[PDB]
Write a protein that binds this ligand. Structure first.
Ligand SMILES: [Zn+2]
Ligand SMILES: [Zn+2]
Ligand SMILES: [Zn+2]
Lengths: 337, 408, 595, 159
DNA sequence: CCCCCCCCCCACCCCCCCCCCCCCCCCCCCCCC
DNA sequence: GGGGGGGGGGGGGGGGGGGGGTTTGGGGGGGGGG
């Protein structure tokens, strides 16, 4: 099936370079190492997993570069336009630049360290003439974009019925009431299969609501020996991510006269899970996305959340004033005679 | 390869069946009961034999009974082989239904009098394939249907016939044509007249009312009846069963002609499943069933009674003031109330049902009401009749409905 | 120079793990646990110096039972096994395989070290399980997350319901269609390793093997829906629930309504998009795969049985917090004892009605008795339906009284209950069973409950110038169903009111009384004491009934006297009814029958 | 029954053997053994029993191979001791056993040498024309009755 | 206490699969050294 | 007398084709009003 192609006004090589430049340079200098590299040292210590990017930081960096007389190609517009792809770009930049840990971890206790060390040892045994992994497997953190402040489309809180099809791919922000919340369930980022007949594990990344499991060992260890070994899934070695779904509905006041209240599925992943509960009235930033059902199913990949909603010394302020029972009783509904 | 264990089990069972010796309250003219029962089957041209489990248990150090208890499902064909040889030895007329071809006769080995009754809640899968006895109350009974027992087919492209095709839980067809001049695999027509069927009836049981631990929901089990045991049970009856605890696969998932696979876990890899994975129910394959909860001529009743029972009836009619003794035998837990006891006797004896020249029926039954204070013995009269009389039922005036009374 | 057995993904040597566990399974002393934990001051040699898990293994061998229960904290006390606790919590399947095999190995080691006559063949036949428990903090069901997915966890929760037992194939059985040779295959990770050609080289036909289903060998599996308790929820939103798989003899270890702990490996599995396809849905199903479960003697009994004050001693213990009212407490004590039974109908029940004002403590007495009894129920009679109290409609489900089969049924507000519902309780008190007949449902539903009714005079007060029948407004023969009927009244008396106020206000001063011993004593009496009647009881039974019959009475009083005398004869473990039992049964009835 | 008990004990030995070769817990319970070889490389198997017995692990790894060497194959006469499975036996009824053994006894005691002389003194002639079936049946006759009389004479000095 | 109400319960593409064909390997037989 | 080469059988792989994947009425039970 041949495909046509077109030229477009973007370049992900140039923007990848811009993203890593931002990452290794920026700090919140108006408040006077880089914010993001320091935060990635916290990630390297395994003290943090929620990597938050502020679009305001990107905007400040763009303004700093433009002030220094070079065009920054408006990365804010690009991430507000095709947000999902720039998750991949930002994560690749982090994986290419994150510094080593400082705090001790007891590194062998993670199965991924042992299994990838064993694969490296095996690959060195091969490499004496006698990627190592898909990066999502090793990537422990979760990356989220946080919207622009008032000062731009990501900043505006849309009601659900204003979310039209032209917004698909954009990092929009929605407003409504959560009518339902799912229980948490795990979802596979990367499946790890053992191979029975050679022990060389193999990996499948999953990027859809369904997949088909592997059967035959595709590794060179088996394939060169034409040994049709069988693959078995391991939950120990597979990377899971926490998944949860929530149904958001527009506010009852926003419903036009006679219309049914419109609603949307929000999907939330990683550490951002269980930030929402039913009956919450909330603003949520996310990528508005299609899903396989020409009519597509659709959902919002959540990224950032804004909910709408000492003492034992301070009690002495009333105790010292005296007759507190009589006064506190008189403070019960003072508007009632 | 022949299973020497099964062959030796067959030999031991065959010897038992032909010469197991016992007699009681008589000289030692041993009846050799199961040989005599083959003769009884031959006289009445039956197709089943009833075996007491304890008789096997005492026989030859009990090893045969232990084996047939533990691993019944392996050893049942070997038992039928032994039985077939014994019946040939002492009653060869029974080997056919008994010129037009009389089919070979099938034989059911109905065990009874097992050491213990396991509850439905005691079902545990190591007892799969073992002979047990089971109890519960029957909630519903299926239509009696013909199970295809052993099948016969003719090939579509040559009119050769395959025969004696043993059936799995699926309707099973031959894989290869017997004719080496023919090419066929899997294209067949069933010869109905040559194929063999069994009367078949599924019945579902549930855990007994007094045995449910705290009056909660009872547990349920599917039971299979076949042959002469079908349609003996009834809904609401409380029954003891004996037979084999068995697994039953999801036959649709296994693949079945004319049916799609059905669309917690099963098991996969087996060739017939391909990608699919198979699940199993548990069921009880019953060989014998009994409950644990009229004659209109004197001869047809009296010919069922023993000689000493006949003597009891003779003493009863000889004792011509028996009429008083009967009334005093009514409701023995209740003191006094002789008039009620007399009426209860006359109700249980009833009048005579009659039909008139115009078709009008005239009632035979006698209807009685016993009026009294609630401290009186009144309810014990009802519980006596309910405990004593055949085909009798008990309910309360409150906590019952017109539907539950006549019919719903 | 040699291969190494490694727990995959961990670099743990399995041989070293095995030795580290073996050297704890033997030579461990329970004192080491008291060195690890609190209560270190209470080390006691004659209970702590035993080789505790060899004591377990020897008792286990004498009983011939497969299971060793193992508190996980004990691994941290023994020096060579501290690391193995962490290995267990992080890699439970492999460590538990090691522990199971080591238990079986140690059973062999003990009989061969002792060179004992116990069957080696039995030990070799027997499978052996460790059941580890008390793993750690019982983290909430709501809090489980992808890091837990292979760990051992422990959850507190409520069982909503369970499946029937499900057969799980552990060994497949393959028979050759050509040559009738048979072979066995252990199921590996749910996959049948089918032989592609027949094993016998003299046959070796391809695709000739077929699965003989009922000659395969099966383990037991059961699935149970375990709910987050409504106690622990953030109360504005629903409780969660989790499926758990429970296996072999752990099947049916719990029932609907049980609050339990379950200790197990957390697990996850994919689920198919369509059973006709290999295609899997991205988000896995999750379940806990359990290895241990938990809910929520006579020498002492004989010592108490010899006491002379034992009648009052047991009577005070039922409710020492309430005013002493000891005729009521003694009558209830006889209701807790019960009589005896005869199958030829009658029952060894006892039935009581607390009349008196609504302004008295009888409801609290009922509350304590409902706590004391093993299997009772509590409800109240106002607006109580004849079917709601009893059994209701498709299936019929049991009501409160039927759920109280074999225990005390407390019913408050009994005087306000409609005559229809009383008409159902007639056959409870007369036959202790319910003779239903409705559309599709006919049954004699057995319900052997000792009713403890609490009732009132009509209106705000009892009239002292009238008998109890004229006050209570329930008809006399309904009162004659019950054994004892009592008046407890609020009438002013400064002596009684002072001593009651003192009795009540003494509760706030202090830091057989306890109900645990009372209910144990009643239980042991029910298991052991079944009094037969002596002629010295018969004579007074016949005489006393004929007395109150020409005071005007019925045989239900005589039957009540019999059941009460048998209940009285369960005191002092007497096990024989005599004159005094009848005298007290009669005497307490003389307090009641005066009306 | 005595011999049946003996047989059942013998196959109960195979029961305890397969039980040793069987998991103590359910099939979905399987953890992973890794066999690190004497070299710095690793294999993987799911056998819970194999996890504590490397012999089982090694042989199970070998059982897992899908490959096999392909094996190549290998009428006017009846089935016999020439082509039956080596454990096959006729399970006589004891009356038929007595009747058959006494019949062949009396045959050996009368008809054997005379018959064998007659037919072998035929088969001296016409060997070139002796049909294959006739050859094999003659040889089997010879072998069977010679073997029987040797065995009976080992059992009976009277023979 | 009796009757009426009302509530419940029920009746087009992609994957798996199977069939057909072609090639390659392995054994047996014959010739050559 | 053993090893190579030629010829025939048998098995495995790969490709191609095909099929499958909520309203309305009635009875009976249960509860409330005259
Ligand atoms: Zn491999
Ligand atoms: Zn044909
Ligand atoms: Zn075979």
């Amino acid at each position: 099936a041949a495909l046509p192609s077109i030229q477009l006004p973007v370049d992900y090589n140039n923007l990848f370079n811009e993203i890593t430049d931002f990452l290794v340079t920026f700090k919140q200098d108006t408040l006077s190492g880089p914010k993001y590299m320091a935060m990635l040292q916290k990630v390297a210590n395994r003290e943090l997993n929620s990597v938050i990017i502020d679009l305001d930081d990107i905007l400040q960096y763009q303004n700093e570069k433009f002030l220094q007389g070079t065009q920054a190609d408006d990365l804010v517009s690009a991430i507000q336009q095709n947000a999902n792809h720039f998750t991949e770009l930002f994560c690749r930049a982090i994986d290419n630049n994150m510094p080593l840990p400082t705090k001790e971890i007891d590194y062998k206790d993670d199965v991924l360290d042992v299994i990838l060390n064993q694969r490296r040892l095996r690959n060195e045994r091969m490499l004496s003439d006698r990627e190592l992994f898909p990066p999502n497997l090793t990537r422990r953190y979760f990356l989220y974009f946080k919207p622009l402040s008032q000062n731009a489309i990501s900043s505006k809180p849309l009601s659900v019925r204003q979310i039209k099809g032209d917004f698909l791919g954009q990092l929009i922000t929605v407003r409504g009431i959560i009518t339902r919340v799912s229980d948490v369930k795990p979802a596979v980022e990367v499946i790890a299969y053992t191979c029975d007949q050679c022990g060389y594990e193999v990996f499948q990344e999953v990027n859809s609501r369904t997949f088909t499991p592997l059967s035959e060992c595709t590794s060179e260890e088996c394939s060169q020996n034409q040994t049709k070994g069988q693959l078995f899934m391991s939950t120990r070695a597979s990377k899971f991510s926490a998944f949860q779904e929530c149904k958001i509905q527009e506010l009852s006041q926003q419903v036009p006269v006679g219309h049914i209240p419109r609603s949307l599925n929000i999907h939330v992943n990683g550490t951002l899970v269980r930030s929402l509960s039913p009956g919450d009235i909330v603003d949520v930033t996310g990528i508005f996305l299609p899903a396989p059902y020409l009519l597509t199913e659709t959902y919002l990949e959540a990224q950032f959340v804004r909910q709408h909603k000492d003492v034992e010394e301070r009690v002495m302020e009333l105790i010292t004033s005296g007759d507190v029972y009589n006064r506190l009783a008189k403070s019960i509904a003072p508007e009632i005679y | 390869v022949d299973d020497v264990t099964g062959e030796k089990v067959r030999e031991a069972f065959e010897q038992f069946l032909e010469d197991f010796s016992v007699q009681s309250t008589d000289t030692g003219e041993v009846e050799k009961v199961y040989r005599a029962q083959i003769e009884f089957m031959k006289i009445y041209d039956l197709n089943t034999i009833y075996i007491d489990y304890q008789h096997l248990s005492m026989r030859e150090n009990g090893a045969l009974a232990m084996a047939i208890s533990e691993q019944y499902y392996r050893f049942l064909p070997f038992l039928q082989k032994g039985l077939r040889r014994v019946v040939r030895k002492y009653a060869p007329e029974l080997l056919n239904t008994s010129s037009p071809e009389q089919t070979e006769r099938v034989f059911q080995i109905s065990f009874f009098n097992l050491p213990t009754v396991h509850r439905i809640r005691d079902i545990r899968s190591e007892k799969i394939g073992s002979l047990l006895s089971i109890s519960g109350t029957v909630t519903r009974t299926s239509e009696v249907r013909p199970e295809l027992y052993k099948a016969s087919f003719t090939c579509d492209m040559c009119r050769a016939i395959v025969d004696n095709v043993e059936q799995s839980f699926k309707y099973t067809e031959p894989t290869f044509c017997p004719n080496p001049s023919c090419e066929n695999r899997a294209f067949w027509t069933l010869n109905v007249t040559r194929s063999r069927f069994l009367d078949w009836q599924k019945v579902r049981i549930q855990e007994n009312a007094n045995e449910i631990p705290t009056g909660s929901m009872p547990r349920t089990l599917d039971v299979i009846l076949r042959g002469d045991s079908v349609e003996r049970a009834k809904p609401g009856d409380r029954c003891k069963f004996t037979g084999v605890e068995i697994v039953v696969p999801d036959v649709t998932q296994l693949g079945l002609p004319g049916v799609k696979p059905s669309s917690n876990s099963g098991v996969t890899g087996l060739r017939s499943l391909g990608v699919r994975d198979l699940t199993y129910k548990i069921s009880f394959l019953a060989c014998h069933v009994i409950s644990i909860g009229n004659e209109r001529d004197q001869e047809v009743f009296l010919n069922s009674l023993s000689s000493d029972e006949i003597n009891e009836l003779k003493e009863m009619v000889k004792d011509e003031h028996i009429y008083d003794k009967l009334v005093r035998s009514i409701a023995p837990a209740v003191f006094g109330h002789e008039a009620v006891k007399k009426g209860i006797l006359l109700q249980m004896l009833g009048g005579v049902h009659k039909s008139t020249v115009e078709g009008i029926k005239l009632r035979g039954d006698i209807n009685i009401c016993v009026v009294g204070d609630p401290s009186t013995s009144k309810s014990q009269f009802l519980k006596y009749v309910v405990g004593f009389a055949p085909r009798s039922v008990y309910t309360s005036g409150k906590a019952s409905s017109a539907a539950g009374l006549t019919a719903a | 120079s040699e291969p190494l057995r490694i727990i995959w993904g961990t670099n743990v040597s399995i041989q070293e793990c095995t030795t580290n566990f073996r050297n704890f399974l033997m030579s461990f002393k329970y004192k080491f646990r008291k060195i690890l934990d609190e209560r270190e001051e209470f080390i006691n040699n004659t209970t702590d110096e035993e080789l505790y898990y060899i004591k377990q293994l020897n008792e286990m061998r004498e009983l011939g039972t497969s299971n060793l229960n193992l508190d996980a904290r004990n691994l941290l006390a023994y020096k060579q096994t501290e690391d193995l606790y962490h290995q267990l919590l992080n890699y439970p399947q492999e460590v538990i395989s090691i522990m199971d095999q080591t238990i079986k190995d140690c059973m062999v080691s003990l009989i061969v070290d002792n060179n004992l006559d116990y069957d080696l063949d039995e030990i070799e036949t027997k499978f052996y399980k460790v059941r580890p428990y008390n793993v750690g903090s019982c983290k909430g069901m709501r809090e489980l997350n992808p890091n837990d997915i292979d760990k051992l966890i422990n959850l507190k929760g409520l069982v909503l319901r369970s499946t029937p037992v499900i057969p799980d194939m552990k060994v497949a059985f393959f028979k050759c269609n050509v040559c009738d040779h048979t072979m066995a295959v252990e199921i590996d990770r749910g996959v049948i390793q089918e032989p592609a050609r027949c094993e016998r080289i003299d046959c070796n036909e391809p695709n000739s093997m077929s699965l003989i289903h009922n000659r395969c060998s099966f383990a037991d599996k059961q699935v149970i829906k375990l709910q987050e308790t409504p106690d622990f929820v953030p109360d504005g939103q629903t409780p969660h629930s989790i499926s758990l798989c429970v296996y072999d003899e752990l099947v049916d270890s719990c029932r609907a309504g049980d609050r339990i702990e379950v200790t197990g490996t957390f697990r996850s599995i994919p689920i198919r998009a369509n059973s006709r396809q290999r295609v899997l849905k991205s988000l896995y199903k999750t379940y806990v795969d359990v290895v241990h479960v938990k809910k929520v003697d006579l020498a002492k009994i004989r010592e108490v049985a010899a006491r002379e004050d034992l009648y009052s001693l047991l009577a005070r213990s039922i409710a020492p917090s309430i005013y002493e009212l000891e005729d009521v407490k003694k009558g209830i004590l006889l209701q807790l004892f019960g009589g005896t039974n005869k199958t030829f109908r009658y029952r060894g029940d006892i039935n009581i009605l607390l009349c008196g004002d609504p302004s008295t403590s009888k409801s609290q007495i009922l509350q304590y008795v409902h706590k004391i009894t093993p299997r009772g129920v509590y409800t109240s009679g106002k607006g109580s339906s004849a079917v709601g109290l009893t059994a209701y409609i498709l299936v019929l489900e049991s009501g409160a009284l039927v759920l109280s089969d074999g225990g005390v049924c407390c019913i408050d507000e009994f005087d306000k209950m409609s005559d229809s519902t009383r008409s159902v309780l007639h056959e409870v008190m007369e036959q202790q069973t319910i003779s239903i007949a409705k559309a599709g449902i006919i049954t004699t539903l057995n319900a052997r409950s000792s009713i403890l009714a609490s009732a009132n005079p009509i209106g705000s007060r009892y009239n002292p110038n009238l008998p109890v029948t004229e006050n209570i407004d329930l008809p006399p023969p309904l009162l004659s169903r019950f054994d004892l009927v009592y008046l407890v009244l609020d009438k002013v008396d400064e002596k009684n009111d002072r001593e009651l106020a003192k009795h009540l206000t003494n509760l706030y001063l202090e830091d057989v009384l306890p109900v645990e011993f009372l209910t144990m004593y009643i239980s042991y009496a029910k298991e052991h004491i079944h009094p037969i009647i002596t002629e010295a009881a018969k004579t007074e039974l016949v005489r006393a009934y004929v007395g109150m019959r020409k005071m005007t009475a019925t045989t239900r009083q005589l039957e009540s006297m019999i059941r009460l005398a048998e209940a009285h004869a369960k005191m002092k473990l007497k096990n024989v009814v005599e004159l005094e039992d009848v005298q007290e049964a009669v005497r307490l009835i003389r307090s009641a029958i005066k009306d | 029954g005595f011999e049946l008990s003996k047989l059942l004990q013998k196959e109960h030995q195979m029961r305890k053997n397969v039980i040793k070769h069987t998991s103590a817990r359910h099939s979905r319970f399987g953890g992973l053994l890794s066999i690190q070889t004497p070299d710095k490389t690793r294999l993987t198997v799911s056998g819970s029993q194999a996890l504590v017995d490397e012999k089982i692990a090694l042989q199970k790894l070998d059982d897992s191979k899908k490959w096999n060497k392909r094996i190549i194959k290998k009428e006017g006469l009846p089935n016999s001791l020439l082509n039956s499975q080596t454990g096959k036996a006729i399970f006589f009824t004891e009356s038929n056993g007595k009747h058959f053994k006494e019949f062949i006894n009396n045959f050996i005691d009368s008809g054997f040498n005379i018959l064998l002389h007659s037919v072998t003194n035929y088969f001296t002639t016409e060997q070139d024309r002796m049909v294959t079936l006739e050859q094999v049946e003659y040889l089997l006759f010879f072998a069977w009755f010679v073997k029987y009389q040797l065995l009976r004479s080992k059992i009976d000095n009277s023979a």
